[PDB]
Structure formats: structure tokens, C-alpha cells
Amino acid sequence: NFAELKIKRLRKKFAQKMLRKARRKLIYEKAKHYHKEYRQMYRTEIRMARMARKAGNFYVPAEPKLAFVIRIRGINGVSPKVRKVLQLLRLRQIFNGTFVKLNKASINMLRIVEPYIAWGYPNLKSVNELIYKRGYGKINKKRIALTDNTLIARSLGKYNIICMEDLIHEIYTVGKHFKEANNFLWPFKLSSPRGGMKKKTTHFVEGGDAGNREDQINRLIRRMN
Amino acid sequence: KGKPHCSRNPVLVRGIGRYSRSAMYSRKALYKRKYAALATVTKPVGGGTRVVKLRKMPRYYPTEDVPRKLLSHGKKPFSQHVRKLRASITPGTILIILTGRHRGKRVVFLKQLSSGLLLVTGPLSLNRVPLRRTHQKFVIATSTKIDISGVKIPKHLTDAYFKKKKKYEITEQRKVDQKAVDSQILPKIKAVPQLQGYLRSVFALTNGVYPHKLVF
């Protein structure tokens, strides 16, 4: 028989194909909306600074909410407290990197381990490149390279993150589930900095590489990835 | 049925079209293009008729066999590879053969062949080289050119013509083709003063001159 079963097979196939097409359109429109939002955010600071200058006052921009941290010292001879903080920040290997959202706790935690890390405020392009090139997902306690959107969609579907654009937007804007997104994100393994470092041991202010560099972390990332 | 129209968008960049999805939906006029829903042969025999089965089963299977291969897409046979040519090489340019039996002989270049090899010849009347093929990598292209846009070379010569056979005897067809090409090439190079002697000479490196310094 199966005169109906055979057509039902392809009916199910067509339904699945239409569902996939709808999902693709959804993520495409969401990416377009994210691009619009990024442009709006970029122009808003310029507008506010311009109006403040025109009025003669000053416009202090909001303190950055997202930071990128790279471990720049080895495993040998580490104080136990610094070792514990590095373990908590998930920097167990030299030239590992991760994103950290900022608050009092994060500030003090980073201050404890200033000599061992170089951290700064990542740029949108830096986030994009880091996610696309070095970004691997932690699925089933396994380091899986993110080569398809379904891998992201399963691990973060309940948080309405369904593709690379959602992941990047949520990381860059520090969304409501930034903790879940960042934890799903495996720590980045960056190559050695092409062109060399200035001086690993000392602080960035005194001509070294350790400590906080506000936006030079983007210059560092460009050569470390 | 239906004559195959050309693509409606010029290639902006490789893999990216000039017009978007909606512009294409308009240009294709798809708003009015909606659509909706062997192995046996009978033969006579002198008995009766026999249903002979072509594609019969093999009479020997090997002890063991290798499995199939996984499928790959970007790999194409050498026949349909895209052919590249250096910018400095144009018809009528002087080349310096670097690796053949004709080491360092200045030779006039005529045409790019189908498999990528250069069809080259300096009239063997003066520098002693016939119609020949040469890989574009193994030649130095100097910046001296003659005008051969107004010469005709036979269409019958090709890679199948120049393919090696099997003592090698030159054929009368080879001789007549060489004469036909050189009878037009030679007057062009004789117009330029001191060019025949230049082609007769042989390139070489003496002490104190270095290729990265000297220009050609």
C-alpha cells in the first residue's frame, strides 16, 4: 500500500525544509537589526560628546562593562592566591584569553593578578574576529569548534541565542545571560604576539605589558590572533 | 524548452552578485513565473528465442577489495583547470628560455595554448629554434615587444599537434608550418634596428651583474 505513506515522507521533508528556511530568514533579519543597533550605539557617543562640547561642558562616557584578559606569564612559581584567581578566571595556560564583565568584584580580582595578565576594553572588531577565528564552544564538556549555528542554538537556545550574531551581540553588549554565553565559550588560545612584547615583567604604564591598557588591547589582539 | 538566457547579474566579485534577492525576483520576473503541481534483450536462435542478459555477473571476485572514497568538491581534472598568464607576457614579446636545451636564447612569443603552455618561436633562420612549447614559469619576459597583432597562425596547430609520439624525424607539415609562421614574423623583427642580432645572441650572466639589480 503506502500510497499515502510515501507522500507523507516528502510532506515531512518539505515541512522541515520550510522550517529551516524560516529560521534562516529570522537569523538574517536579526543580524541586520544588530548592525543597525551597533551603528546607533557608535553614533550616540559622538553626538553626546559634540553637544557637551558645544555647551562648553564635558561628557564623560560610561565606564566600560566588558574587558578582555590575556595571561602573559608561565606556570612556574606562582603565589597560591594568584593561582586561585587565575583558575577562577580560566587562565590556566600562557597566552590564554577570556572575556570578563566588570564590577567591583571583577576589578579587585583583576587587581590581585595584575602582574600576570594584560587586560583591556575590547573593540567590536576584536570581538568579531575572536569569536569567528578562535571561538570554540564547550559542548558536553568537550571543546568543539563552532562550524555551524545549530551547535550554538542547542547550547544557548533557552537564552534566545541561536547563532553567531546572537553570541557576539550578547558578549559585546553584556546581556542578561552574559554569564551563560561566556561560560559556554571556551577560553581562547591565542598565538604568541607577532612583533614581540615590550617587557613582560613590568607594568604597561612603565613601558611593559602587564596591567590595564584601556584600548591598546585591540592592538595586542590584532597580533596575538 | 526555452532558450537559455544569460545570467541577469554581472559578477561584482567572485561569488557575490551585483543585485540582491529582491532585485533578482524582479529582474527574473518571477512574479509572473509561478508554477504549481534495459538489462535484457530478446534474440532469436536457430530452440526459439533467448532472453540474453547483458551486464552479466563477473566470473571472479577478488579475495578482498578496498572501500569507496569520501566525496570532495573542489577537485577538477587538469583539462578544465583555469589557465593563468603573467601580465608582462603579451603576444609579440621577447622571452629568455631558462631551462630547455635552448638555454638563454631570446625567442619571440606568439600565443597561449590551451593547456597553459606558451607557443613560442624565434625564427630558426637566425636563432635556431622551431615552433615549440614552453612553460611560462621557466622563461624570463623582457620588456621589449614587437607588433604581431596582424599575423595569422594556423588553427590546426595545438597541444595535440605538439604532443610527443611513441629517432625523431621532422615532418614536412612541421617544415611548412614553420615557414608559414616565419615568413610573417621575420619582416616585423627586421623593421626594428639591431633586433635580428639581438635574437641571434645568447643571454648570459657575467661577474658584477645581478638579476635583482638589472631590469629587463
Partner: peptide, 19 residues
């Protein structure tokens, strides 16, 4: 529409409309 459950009828609608 992209929701597998509530978007089934809308998906059917657009699929039939394409015809």
C-alpha cells in the same frame, strides 16, 4: 513563524501562497 509549534500554520500559509 520560526517557532516550530505556533508557526506551523503560518509556514503552511506562506508555502501555499508561493504556489
Amino acid at each position: 513563524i520560526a517557532h516550530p509549534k505556533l508557526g506551523r500554520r503560518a509556514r503552511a500559509r506562506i508555502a501555499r501562497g508561493l504556489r
